[PDB]
């Protein structure tokens, strides 16, 4: 009954694959031949934000699409005004090895986390005026690789112990755990409708999770190697995974399978970060050839490049109004592009 | 308006104070040398950072260790907290001057695992430039094991029989030369890794350490000095 049900799960995995092949009625590139191509997008380093001492490994834009937060492994979490090129705040982190930072939608809070296995929440609009840590979310054992605020009181944090978790900042405990992943969870993106989130891991799998039920809604395994970063399509009915096999992939939620691949023969290094434009026509992907290529997400064509760094591009973000991109990198300097 | 120009002047004042703090911590950051500690549990990385500590480290996550010899700040990171897979959080330690990689030399069934780990460190694309200060630990236990017999390197390494010691030391291996044949052979098994890869972007620095020793910090000092000097000579060839 044990090996019998493992065999049944094997034929169940095979019938899921074959049912996806039956439900793959028409591909995306088949119908888009009538579409005019997006043309050559050329984008320029509008701002160049200097003032990190070590490699920048994460950034998050603000919801007002002007402020941003950058995380770098010298120990500084810095809030930057992109318009003025003025560092609004600088934060000395308790442990410098951080891999993620999240900006709250209200803007009152900022998050960080890394190899010290605690998700630190700093309050910005504070009573005294000096920003300080408001909460230290402990309970994950692996390194924290992505965190995202839902609100001022709910944050999802991915981790290197293969489990995502939904946390209450006020109590300080994990409201929900998400333990389905086999490999180290390297990213997460919450939906525009915020009812659900997808997270990718090193097991080449991206899993869709419902935040209220807390169960694995869906799993996608179309990649070959470690999924480094993930991002929903802005409609919320698809997402793009950037993985270390030098390919990006688009997965639709209701199709429950892969749509297209975003890769070229020349590009052989890994995606470190991936993001979407406001319409979602341009898929943006940072890389380890020190650049940031942008694809027609509908046509799968390498339609531009953002070469401004001489180390790898770790983090990639797009404003909510779409007016800017912020590519941080390991060369300690972040850049605003349009 | 006038108030908006006053507020952007306040933004410039805040930016000036932030930038002054950033330079004031930049000087400290560039003065301090970061080091990554790797190894296994049987390999005495704990006692080695104990002699660096005795001559505020938290268990949760990173274990940090701070020391200085000859007024040079060394800050070295034992990762005691993460999981057993390390293909991703090892990318954080890419701006590190030198990796200290501690090997239990007296356990020959874990030596091949240690060699594979060293090979991964040497050939990692984000570790292609970091020198590895190799610390072949527990040379008391290796000497006692080889002198005791009943456990042979040819059991776990067939090419030990075709080995002789090219260069050695008199006082430390002065009890018996056969253990010298042991203690250099393992060393060559790392250097065979350390030579075949790359056009000299980084250098291994092997060392022989017993259970308790004193000159670990001095060895880290001199090997970091040689690696940073080699970096600056490659910059003199370039800058």
């Amino acid at each position, epitope marked *: 009954e044990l090996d019998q049900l493992r065999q049944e799960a094997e034929q169940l995995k095979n019938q899921i694959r074959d049912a996806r092949k039956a439900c793959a009625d028409a591909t995306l590139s088949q119908i888009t031949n009538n579409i005019d191509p997006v043309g050559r997008i050329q984008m320029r380093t509008r701002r160049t934000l200097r003032g990190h001492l070590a490699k920048i490994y994460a950034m998050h834009w603000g919801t007002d699409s002007r402020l941003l937060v950058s995380a770098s492994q010298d120990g500084k979490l810095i809030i930057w005004d992109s318009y003025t090129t003025n560092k609004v705040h600088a934060i000395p982190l308790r442990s410098s090895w951080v891999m993620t930072c999240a900006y709250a939608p209200s803007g009152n809070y900022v998050a960080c986390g890394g190899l010290d296995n605690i998700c630190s929440i700093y309050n910005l609009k504070t009573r005294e005026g000096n920003v300080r840590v408001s909460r230290e979310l402990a309970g994950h054992t692996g390194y924290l690789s992505c965190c995202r605020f839902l609100d001022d009181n709910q944050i999802v944090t991915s981790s290197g112990d293969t489990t995502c978790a939904l946390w209450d900042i006020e109590t300080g405990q994990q409201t929900t755990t998400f333990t389905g992943h086999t*490999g180290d969870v390297m990213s997460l993106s919450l939906a525009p409708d915020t009812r659900l989130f997808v997270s990718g891991a090193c*097991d080449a799998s991206a899993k869709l999770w419902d935040v209220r039920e807390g169960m694995c809604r869906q799993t996608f395994t179309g990649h*070959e*190697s470690d999924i480094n970063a993930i991002c929903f399509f802005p409609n919320g009915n698809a997402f793009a995974t950037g993985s270390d096999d030098a390919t990006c992939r688009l997965f639709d939620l209701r199709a429950d399978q892969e749509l297209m691949t975003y890769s070229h023969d020349n590009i052989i290094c890994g995606i470190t970060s991936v993001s979407f434009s406001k319409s979602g026509r341009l898929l943006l992907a940072g890389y380890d050839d020190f650049n940031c290529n942008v694809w027609d997400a509908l046509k799968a064509d390498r339609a531009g490049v953002l070469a401004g760094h001489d180390n790898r591009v770790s983090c990639l973000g797009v404003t909510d109004d779409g007016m800017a991109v912020a590519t941080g990198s390991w060369d300690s300097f972040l850049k605003i592009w349009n | 308006t006038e108030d908006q120009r006053n507020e952007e002047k306040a933004q410039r004042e805040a930016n000036k104070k932030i930038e002054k703090q950033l330079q004031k911590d930049k000087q400290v950051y560039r003065a301090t040398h970061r080091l990554l500690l790797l190894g296994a549990d049987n390999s005495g990385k704990s006692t080695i950072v104990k002699q660096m500590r005795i001559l505020s480290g938290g268990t949760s996550g990173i274990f940090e260790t701070k020391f200085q010899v000859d007024k040079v700040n060394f800050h070295m990171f034992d990762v005691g907290g993460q999981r*057993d897979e390390r293909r991703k959080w090892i990318q954080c330690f890419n701006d590190v001057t030198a990796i200290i990689f501690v090997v239990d030399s007296s356990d020959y069934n874990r030596l091949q695992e240690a060699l594979n780990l060293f090979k*991964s460190i040497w*050939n990692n694309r984000w570790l292609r430039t970091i020198s590895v200060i190799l610390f072949l630990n527990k040379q008391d236990l290796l000497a006692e094991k080889v002198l005791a017999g009943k456990s042979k390197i040819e059991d776990y390494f067939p090419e030990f029989a075709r080995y002789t010691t090219p260069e050695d030391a008199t006082p430390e291996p002065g009890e018996d030369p056969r253990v010298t044949r042991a203690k250099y052979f393992i060393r060559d098994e790392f250097l065979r890794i350390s030579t075949a890869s790359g056009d000299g972007r980084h250098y291994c620095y092997p060392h022989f350490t017993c259970a308790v020793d004193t000159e670990n910090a001095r060895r880290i000092f001199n090997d970091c000095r040689d690696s940073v000097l080699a970096r600056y000579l490659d910059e003199i060839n370039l800058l």
Partner: nanobody
Amino acid sequence: QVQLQESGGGLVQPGGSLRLSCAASGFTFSNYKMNWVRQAPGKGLEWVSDISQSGASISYTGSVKGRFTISRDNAKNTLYLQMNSLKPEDTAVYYCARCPAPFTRDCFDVTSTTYAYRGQGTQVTV
């Protein structure tokens, strides 16, 4: 899905041979450096052998250096371990394992509890 299915295995005498096989699915086989790992009973996972992307660089752990030999068929997407001269300490569960990244020389396959890109494993015994 990245799926590695083992084959071969089964009973063999204490001087016998088995050709352990691993078929690969869901990735370009030529891009990845391949490994053979064994889980001994009462022991942790330990690396046995590996082969480069082109089949040029081949290495073995020292207990099996002369005895075993590996070959990889990129046409058939299959990793082969010819196992000669079995001992009772050669009896273990045998996993093929591809290295986590492509186009790379570094590998982090043999882990303590789990690794994503191992096969299911076929047991070999005395």
